[PDB]
RNA sequence: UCGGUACGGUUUGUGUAGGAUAGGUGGGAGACUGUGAAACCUCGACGCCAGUUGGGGCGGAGUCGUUGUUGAAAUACCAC
RNA sequence: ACUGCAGGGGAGACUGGAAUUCCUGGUGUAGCGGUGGAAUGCGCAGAUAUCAGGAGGAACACCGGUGGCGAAGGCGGGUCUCUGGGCAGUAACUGACGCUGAGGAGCGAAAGCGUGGGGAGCGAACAGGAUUAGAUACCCUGGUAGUCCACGCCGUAAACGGUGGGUACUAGGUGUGGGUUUCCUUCCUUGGGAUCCGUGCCGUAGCUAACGCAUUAAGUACCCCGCCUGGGGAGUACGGCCGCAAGGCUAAAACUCAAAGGAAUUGACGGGGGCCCGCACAAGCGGCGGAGCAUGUGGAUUAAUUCGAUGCAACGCGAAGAA
RNA sequence: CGCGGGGUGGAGCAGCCUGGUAGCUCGUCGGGCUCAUAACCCGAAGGUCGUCGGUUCAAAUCCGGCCCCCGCAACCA
RNA sequence: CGCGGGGUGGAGCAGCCUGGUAGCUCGUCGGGCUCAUAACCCGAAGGUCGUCGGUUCAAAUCCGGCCCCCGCAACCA
RNA sequence: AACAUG
């Protein structure tokens, strides 16, 4: 806005898994106001995550996010008759947002049948550094680390 | 296959490019790796990041000839001029005295016409 | 001053597996210390992980492959 | 006339250092150059870079300014030689010897012309590259005349302070350039005062259509000269004069228009400036444009397809109900 | 006929002498940014390394036979 | 009249001695963008390959006939 | 870069 920053909304702790990271995942899965539907998908995929490791699922979730959080994004800027990308530093609570969007997004177009086994397989493949969500992490990094020459115009 | 302990590091820095040559105190070139030598083409050569990659590439190639300390003679109206001096330090050299040797005519030759850009 | 040629000495050699024994072939357990052993020093030689090292400086008697790989297996050591 | 004083005033000769380019040699390896972004181009046959030597040309960093000098154009590296003007003081001398000046004459930036030199860099023309609908341009890479010198021709410029010369008067304030002279003159302070000649800023009376000018007048006055008489046609034609030429000077009319102008005013606008806001962009989430149907509209058709709406701000609008 | 090299991803070319990986460049596809994939950026497809055999544990590399081009020097009555 | 080129979408050009696919550019049409038009952008459509008549299973391509267009020749008394 | 017109 013209008049400075807006207050951001607090997320209440998730009752089944006592963490605000789970309730920040259910709002990315949420479509059309189906929040009790969106929580059955997230809870159901996290129960399937411990059925393939035995480990606690939110520890697997935080290992899955740490492999897909970007550190450098590649925002665009025009100067004269040419454009380029400036590598800028991702503030941390944007990197939480931008990584939860990649896990939900790249697993909606994944090859399984239901959304529970699509979301759970993307979490397990990201907590090992294998999935397509991990692939966009280094594609975001290789794009931004190919443009260090333009890191001197940071607004 | 040489050994020269103290040398001189000449830095030319224009609005288009930067050339970082390292010589002996008699003016014999030891290594010279510039900004287009490291992979850069067009207007990316004049950026300060392209300057500090050239200053590393000439420094660590001069240390293969046993150079441990350089004197710095900079010239030219470029912004890759102080990112090069702070890249010879952070490559294993001791930079010594810094001099500006930019040529200054005493109302000498006629410059080209001004650009109606 | 830069080679070519005939011949001698010196030296070179690192997929993976794995002695670090790291070119082919031969057979080779005795060649191995006043020809003064090993440790220890480091004027150096090279570079791909540990130098295989022509450093010749220091020693006061092994610098053994049957085990446990490079087809695999020696490659200490000797002819080529 | 004498006595001083300041000065890029001018002409001639000699001469200095920096930088650019080229040449020769060394070191050196693969790029350099250029732009908004590139490409043409240069280079890999040893470029650019770098160090030493050499050749040549042109312009003179700092001083340097708002400052100085010159009738104007103009004038700044150094030294020497020849030379022009100005200011102040003394009041020694001459005794109105003054001012202006039609015609005329001389000087007169830059471009250009002739002959002869010289040519580093720059750079019309030209050539390639780019940009674009095109690009005979702007931007890039090259590049001839010319820019320099000697001697002549040209005689034009927004040659401007858009303000002809001479003279006398008419409040001051305030910087700065050159002198002269006064009280504690050293009160070191090179300070204040007076006065003469410049060159700036402000400002009174007065003037002006207004903007503005204002002791350096565009004020108040006198002398002489140049010029104007609506806008175009036109500073053109024809005639003459000058010129090697380009062209310069002198200079009309037919015809056509009822305006063309100057200053200021309010607005609107700007690919002007400052500040500021808005789902304007960004950051997000879900769409439309493709399918089938519904509804309105354009066009077409029909005997009639009733009329109205037509960029945002008409089009599931008037129509909250056409068998 | 002798000699003297060469065939490798859609095009180009290293690796070959000296045996253990098939790579680089351009073209293409896809994505990104953008007025313009002009450029710039990332990922991938595209290969019995001319074909047969042969030698070695193992051959793009080395041997031989074959097709297929390019040179040179002849031969050309 | 000789010789040798040519006729392909609305325009200008490819494709043909290499018989089995008809191509590029501008233009026309439909949609964007704009207050509107140019420029720009997306999507399409359009050709008996001059006529005829052979050859062939098959002809723009091969071979003859005509009808047009273009160029070079037409000299010695 | 960029951009004509009424
Ligand atoms: Mg003088
Ligand atoms: Mg010099
Ligand atoms: Mg020269
Ligand atoms: Mg040079
Ligand atoms: Mg002088
Ligand atoms: Mg008398
Ligand atoms: Mg007179
Ligand atoms: Mg007169
Ligand atoms: Mg004259
Ligand atoms: Mg002149
Ligand atoms: Mg001349
Ligand atoms: Mg001449
Ligand atoms: Mg041109
Ligand atoms: Mg030019
Ligand atoms: Mg001429
Ligand atoms: Mg003269
Ligand atoms: Mg003037
Ligand atoms: Mg006048
Ligand atoms: Mg007067
Ligand atoms: Mg005065
Ligand atoms: Mg005033
Ligand atoms: Mg007046
Ligand atoms: Mg008139
Ligand atoms: Mg005239
Ligand atoms: Mg006349
Ligand atoms: Mg006006
Ligand atoms: Mg405005
Ligand atoms: Mg709002
Ligand atoms: Mg947005
Ligand atoms: Mg639809
Ligand atoms: Mg109607
Ligand atoms: Mg409505
Ligand atoms: Mg259309």
Curated annotation (Swiss-Prot), chain A:
Name used for this protein in its record: Small ribosomal subunit protein uS7
NCBIfam families: rpsG_bact (TIGR01029)
Statement: the UniProt record of this protein carries the keyword RNA-binding: yes
Job description of the protein: One of the primary rRNA binding proteins, it binds directly to 16S rRNA where it nucleates assembly of the head domain of the 30S subunit. Is located at the subunit interface close to the decoding center, probably blocks exit of the E-site tRNA.
Disulphide bridges: none
Pfam families the record matches: Ribosomal_S7
InterPro entries: Ribosomal_uS7 (IPR000235), Ribosomal_uS7_bac/org-type (IPR005717), Ribosomal_uS7_CS (IPR020606), Ribosomal_uS7_dom (IPR023798), Ribosomal_uS7_dom_sf (IPR036823)
UniProt subunit comment: Part of the 30S ribosomal subunit. Contacts proteins S9 and S11.
Keyword RNA-binding attached: yes
UniProt GO molecular function: mRNA binding; rRNA binding; structural constituent of ribosome; tRNA binding
PROSITE patterns linked: RIBOSOMAL_S7
Name of the encoding gene: rpsG
Gene3D superfamilies: Ribosomal protein S7 domain
Curated annotation (Swiss-Prot), chain B:
Sorted UniProt keywords: Ribonucleoprotein, Ribosomal protein, RNA-binding, rRNA-binding
Signal peptide annotation: none
Listed GO CC annotations: cytosolic small ribosomal subunit; plasma membrane
Region (Disordered): 96-117
GO terms, biological process: translation
Source organism, top-level taxon: Bacteria
GO molecular function: rRNA binding; structural constituent of ribosome
Disulphide-bonded residues: none
Oligomeric form and interacting partners: Part of the 30S ribosomal subunit. Interacts with proteins S7 and S18. Binds to IF-3.
Job of this protein: Located on the platform of the 30S subunit, it bridges several disparate RNA helices of the 16S rRNA. Forms part of the Shine-Dalgarno cleft in the 70S ribosome.
Family note: Belongs to the universal ribosomal protein uS11 family.
Listed name of the protein: Small ribosomal subunit protein uS11
Provenance organism: Mycobacterium tuberculosis (strain ATCC 25618 / H37Rv)
